[PDB]
């Protein structure tokens, strides 16, 4: 026994140090202030009424007339504070917003032969083949002439109804309110939005001097082929200026120290079994995170490029995307670095009995999870075919899955289930609740419960 | 052993092909766009304020004055966009809406003898015997003279307080707003709604050229015998024009291939046990679906009849109804086609132990399901007699059943339970929660748990 | 065996007939229309804004100024429809509403000695000893002179802050709006509400000729000793005129047939064990219900007393109360009549195993229910002392009990728990959820589970 | 056996008396009236709209302009009822409110070297080192000159973004509305709030003569370094004048009697065992509560000091703080006094089998609670790093813990989880629900279930 404990103790001390270094690094990413940074930003643009005479938020656009009322009203009064603007007196506006639109060709769809005398034209769903590249209206520059994703230094974006290319027709919005109002009013009078539009984007970014963060804003308004409007938004905080405080220089030392542990674990793996799989997972995700972290040092040259002329649009689109992907993988590595503690938790005959239960159980939990999810996904596809054209909570097959988890827990919206289909709605709900929650979910309890008393009946004797 | 595994494997390959054909066919019915088609429609007619000076939605009518304010206001501005109208610039209005009312005779009920000097008349709940067929008001046309369900090409409808005949008094609404306003104002000035009205219906339909769907609208406003008003609505998508894209012509090949599989399974069943019951259920439901699918081709001639003169009401009532019944049965066939996968899932000693648990358990789960539902329905009938005259969530014996499932899951409205009856409300809630959720629901759990360890203790030894 | 089955079958046939007669009698009490009767009533008086320039409902009074705005505004426009009034064109107003107030004496409490130079008077909480009986203001009749509970034909009422006597100062409101406005404005100008008030009541009643029901309305507005206002309401349906239709005359035969069954069971019991306890409970509650039914036939003469002069308040207060008590007891008899079906449900070796589980288990479930409820009520008293001065959901020891059931199920209001006390709120919630829901609630399940496998291990061998 | 029972009976009889005396004491401090005292107070200041024109509550400030609109508007109309003021006609305003602010130095933070030509200054997060002590503006007394926490008789306060010193810049608000409006307007015109503000406090107190309580009010408005505003409030009832009624004089005897029990139990425990641990807990907390109660008798001289000249701010801040801490420890001692009943509950072979289950189980429940909370806290840190900058329900690591308990119970806000991160949101929610609720939580079930059948299999034989 002792010679195994003597190597395990050195691994445990090494691992507690590795855990502590990553926890210090990742607590160093944020302060409670940063939620209020984005909350105060989003309430100014989203939750201010579109006009002083109107009930609608930007969260509640329904037409091109609402979108013009927003972009002439609530947007401009959010951006331009009385040259410079600070969107609150603490937070500097970085120069110049941008508007971009994406558009579809007239006649890009098959009108049925019976209707062609009555309906002259149609415009498809947005796609790279239906996308429109011809110049239109008065043709006075980039608002009315197409430019590609590569010409515009842009990237493809995931909307609600479609993914969208980084390309389009675009305008840069001036330093001040009176200039920008004349620009947006010129687009409106020239009918810059019409039948062919399928999205618009409004982008800008802001710097907080007091806690040293950049917040990058995207507003995306989609214009479905069914008619109507769908608004959406992003407000992303970034720490582009890496180090300024003594605490940043301490994090910079931990950031170097983390690479020594990752190198040590890469060598130990160079020198089949769940802990070895989890070691590879932790190491690979850490190497990916370090690769993104290193790549971000050259992406930060976009800030150096911007600071030569603050009449340019600050293209922090890629920086925000890779900060999000870094934060995503940092959060996931922290999670797996906690799960590995279960290698060491086996202190005594209680902890080893609990951990032996989970590993001996997982064979049957996996078998029953497939068996459960066939029935759950059959219910998801039943729900999608019955309610998916009526109920927001079921509008996509993805939402059918998430809503069926909400219903099993107790977050239920039964009034809209029944109003969508008075015959199948109650039958679906009643049978889903009965077969999932009163019957099938209790199989997990049976599997776990019998495995635990099995394991305890062995460890009482081994 | 080998020959049985090989014949089962040929059935499994045949079944995976059948499954994939039906999954392709039913994914072919819809796109995420279609929810936004009905959402953008319903928000225009339902959620727009009834008048610019008022707070009420069509969802919140409460009087004949609200209904006239709606039909002179929010309705007309939803229908007529500035001859033709597109209900959004993408969706064509098919010619002509229709208004229909159903009505009850004066003196169709027994006034108590003690009150006949004070109350001169009464008007019953709507029924086929209380229904009024006499001409009234100025008698100028079909708005003031009765016509039968068969004269009107209609069908009987399920409302909230009653089912309703397709018959009645009716008017067709003209091509444009100024014509329709003069028609509706003429009905209002002649007092076309009075003591005897028990429902009105407003019907119309629309076509989306961009994704090739019709949408059929019913608004039903009921006028209960208690006084007051109850609004309700339907917005139904329809794919009447079967095939136009290469993907539709591919789906048409899958539609023929599905008939060959159903023929194969009909012959195999012609050439007592749950899989045989499920095999018959899948076959019969698929034969009914194919029958409705064929009958719908005869019904689609109603579109060809309409397109000769677009100054006429498009009677897609039956097409919408049979599309709903087709979607209803199709969704249910998909569900049972997924459940049949369990005929083949017995890959190994884990999967056979899980499937053997459910079949060996279901005997005792059915016994306890009766025993549970006696107590549950006793509580449902207690709740209906105590709260049914006070609380919306218990306003019918059907609502009581669904609300008691919501309460067991934790979707609860306890403040209105107590305000309805301060003595029995808390007693009902407390005892229901204690006896159902803390006690009786755990019997299912005990039955399953003991069955699983029984089955596992056998399959460890057999 | 056979000689036992032959008597049990005759008891079962007798019991199914008794069950059906009672179920017919209680289905005879209601139609789905009756929910809409009370809903349409309550929305007119409660949910209409207090004044056209105001945001408050009667559900949202907060001052005597709101109460005068309601009683001069929304009340009068709800009652008087343009002599007679129909509260909707279907429902007759029975003559005359009544206003009553209850009041407390000046100096009915002990002002501290340190404060008597600064505070000249105090007025206690309402009680029968603090209650005020002196005439005040101009003393022009019953509005300004006290009359007792017996003088006024009244009864004691259960409010929110206190129970109230049926006594007080009172006024009868006239047949028409212009008369009633002059009466209420005279009370307002004479300052009829002042610091001494502790409640007002506004009472009236209504008749629906179309489904033959009366509705009796109480509005109670309480005026707490803390300052402020608490509104509350009752709308109660009544079937005073019992028999008019062929279905009522059928129910009148069922009503007599039910008395024959109760006589038969009284004799059988005159000719220690749970079924015998349940048999006595059903018989006693049925005899109490028949007694209340017979007493209500004598009370119904109040309608005959009213119908001589409809310029008088219809005192249906007792009829509404005894109908509520009849509905309360009838619903409970129906519940126990369903539970007695378990005396016969033992058809087979599955049903007898399920019923033997509950009877053999209940010994230990009762022991653990006490043991659980000591901890639950300790948490209820902890919550009452910490949150009960801050959070509505804990504002009484009864609310604490009902809210803790809601939290165990999943209906949670955690934001207000934390805002009331940022230190103990999270500690209370976290420990309550952990010890009740993750730990103690699983003891009921463990007791049931082990009892079931015990009972099944015997019935496999006996 | 008998000689153990005869001494245990004397302990039980002594303990029931101790229990009853404490329960009488804690009921004696409170009534359901007190919830309506704080509710009627808070609705006047918080829920009244900020002006006659604006929609915002004090609960919904977002700028210095909202704060000035509140303090010139909704505050003053809540305080000064038409010399004296009663905040409802029952509740006297004690003299004089106070406004205090806390402030940070210009240049107290490191502006990055790249930006110093563009951004002239920054102001840090509030801390005792960044705090500003210099006199500013016109310097006309205590509003414009700093005073220490000790000079101001104050204490340090726990806000939302920070703890705050009791020090600062302050003004005492006059007896009447016209005076107080001129004071607040003078601060507004002199720009008393600016870039450097990090909190303001508005404090006052009130007396209810009718139920003999003081209520002490704090309003705290924070001004984060991100720009924007965060409002918060406290309304605390106090029984400072201890005894006046015969019921208070009865409680004064119980309050002395309680000390004889605490002395008896101090002696008995002075003359490893869990019941002795619980005895030490009950005794120490009771001695601490008695110490706080005795200290509060000396603190009540602050009322006697205030009553000499009411043109002064009543500093009931410490009295309110210690009354809250007394209520906290009183509620907790009541809770542990209920738990000690489990010493005596062992009446019979059912109760001793239930109590033997919980003590024999707790070894493994502690082991698994550590094992569960590693995974739960890993998910908490994952959620904090992903959603914490976007979602209010995750805006701190403490909020993440409480929200994850709400989600396990079925209080869910899934729409905002997905809108914050469309990739990781659904993955986090789905895996959290699956691994916590369908899997890991059910280990607690397995532990308890197997322990109960173990203990019962022993007590069937011992």
Residue numbers in the entry:
A (entry chain A3), B (entry chain A4), C (entry chain A1), D (entry chain A2): 34 to 115, 126 to 314, 325 to 515
Text from the published report:
pmcRenal polycystins (PKD1 and PKD2) are ion channel subunits with associated genetic variants that cause autosomal dominant polycystic kidney disease (ADPKD) (1–3). PKD2 forms homotetrameric voltage-dependent and calcium modulated ion channels in primary cilia membranes. Each channel subunit encodes six transmembrane spanning helices (S1 to S6) which fold into structural domains: voltage sensor (VSD, S1-S4), tetragonal opening for polycystins (TOP), pore (PD, S5 and S6), and cilioplasmic (N and C termini). The putative external gate is found within the ion selectivity filter (L641-N643) that is scaffold by two reentrant pore helices (PH1 and PH2), and the internal gate is located at tetrameric S6 junction formed hydrophobic residues (L677).
Like previously resolved WT channel structures, the PKD2 variant subunits formed a domain-swapped tetrameric channel architecture. In the R638C structure, the guanidinium functional group is replaced by a sulfhydryl, disrupting a hydrogen-bond tripartite network formed with carboxylate and hydroxyl sidechains of the PH1 (E631 and T635), and selectivity filter (D643) residues normally found in WT channels. The ADPKD R638C variant removes a cation-π interaction between R638 and F646 and reduces the coupling between the pore helices of adjacent subunits. The VSDs of the F629S and R638C variants structures are captured in the deactivated state with S4 gating charges (K572 and K575) oriented for hydrogen bonding and cation-π interactions that facilitate gating charge transfer. Despite the localized disruptive interactions, the pitch and secondary fold of the PH1 helix are preserved in the F629S and R638C variant structures and only cause a small dilation (ΔRmin < 0.24 Å) in the external gate.
